[PDB]
Design a binder for this molecule. Sequence first.
Ligand SMILES: c1ccc([P+](c2ccccc2)(c2ccccc2)c2ccccc2)cc1
Lengths: 91, 459
Amino acid sequence: VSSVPTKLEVVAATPTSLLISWDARGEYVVYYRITYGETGGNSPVQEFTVPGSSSTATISGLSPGVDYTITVYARSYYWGWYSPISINYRT
Amino acid sequence: LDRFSFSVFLKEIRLLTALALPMLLAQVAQVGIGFVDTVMAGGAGKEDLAAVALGSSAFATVYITFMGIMAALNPMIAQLYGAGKTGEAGETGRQGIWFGLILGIFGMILMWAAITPFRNWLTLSDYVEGTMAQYMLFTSLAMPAAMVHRALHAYASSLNRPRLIMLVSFAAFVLNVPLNYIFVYGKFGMPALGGAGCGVATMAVFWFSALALWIYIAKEKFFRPFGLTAKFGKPDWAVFKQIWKIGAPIGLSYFLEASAFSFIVFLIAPFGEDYVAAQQVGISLSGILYMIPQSVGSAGTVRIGFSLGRREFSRARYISGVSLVSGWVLAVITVLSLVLFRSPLASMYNDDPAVLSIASTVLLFAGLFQPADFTQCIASYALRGYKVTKVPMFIHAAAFWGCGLLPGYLLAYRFDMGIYGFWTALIASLTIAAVALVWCLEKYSMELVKSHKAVSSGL
Ligand SMILES: c1ccc([P+](c2ccccc2)(c2ccccc2)c2ccccc2)cc1
């Protein structure tokens, strides 16, 4: 009965891959799934996954300049998901 | 090609409340040290061949030069008061206090070598020597330059709500005055060597304020990780080699007014002699209260690089505006009492004994370069100060001396009363500061658009 991991930011990349450093005020029960896609709607989704107050990580960002959109995921109390939040800002 | 310092003005919403006000107490402790200074100029006047500045103000060459490098941590430790461990932030602090004691022993060493103003080419005020008890202000007061980098690495760790220095560097000066004279001739004290022993006095107090770092692992949680300040990591361990490309660009860019140092003292020695060596009760009164101005931002450099840690990109570099233009309020609204007033009977014979009976051809640049610059490096205690951007901000300054080289022999060549004359493209050298800098400060607050890569969040 809540909302998301409620910050956003991707400051820079390493214009191949990318640092994604967002909110995690503690955890909850604890867990983050992070989505992994362009916004093409083609090239399938993929999965990063992290622990503690750590949504504050960095992708393996394979492909070049192409628009990339990417969500993090709370997981709590209920082994379900508190909410998600996403931004799309690519290379 | 009409504007290329992009969206200039904007650095504004309702920021009337950018309160960098304990960031003046970063440089009101610095009038506190600024003013030991004269109390042994007009304190070692007990000796009259103790004009003494003759070494003490040519010691403070490799002070304020290596000084730069050190006060170049102001980013680091403010910027990692955007992370958490003041002991990793501090294992710098330590690794720099290793610098500030390592480079500190080069002041301490390049000073040894130093002592050979046994040399000549042009007039007195730079050659003539007979009895030099400067001999020993060279040592008794250059054997300190080690504990004096630490004694500064101090406020290079006052980058996070301490003005615990304004505290000390006053109950510091006051300790010296007493002390100071004891050595010029004193009590039970080592009472003889006097014109260098104002220097063993001064330098004595460096080591005292050197341990006003120690006694301020005191009022809350630590900045003490003084384990073996040791290094080795790659070829040579950084967090130290990192300090490097913040250091370099700075002292070497403090070697701006390090040649506006041998600009200022190479136009008293033509037939300039008399009133052209009063362009120095003038430009002495530049530094004097230019310092609390100027260094509002060399204290604002916190509030900016600090608040990029706490990732408020330009919720900082757009106070790097209303901090820029706020002492910039009296940057002009007290550049007024600089072209206006004089060295009247409000000047006696102090910091440079030359007052009653000389021309006011000296306030004619206490406006020229004066506000047109006032801020024009508090633009850098905000570029470096914010960013790496002393990188070649270094080459901000390769200009203000190579943009003002020719306005060197352009007082000497003049059209009128060209006493503020070689203050030509050395107030245009020095107002192509109004550009290049605050240029990468709209390259550069326009940076934290590229950087603030997720504009905001939800609820
Ligand atoms: C080189 C040597 C001495 C000084 P100054 C001085 C500074 C600024 C403007 C004019 C003069 C000095 C300033 C502040 C503290 C100590 C010394 C200086 C020069 C001649 C005689 C006394 C002091 C400056 C450059």
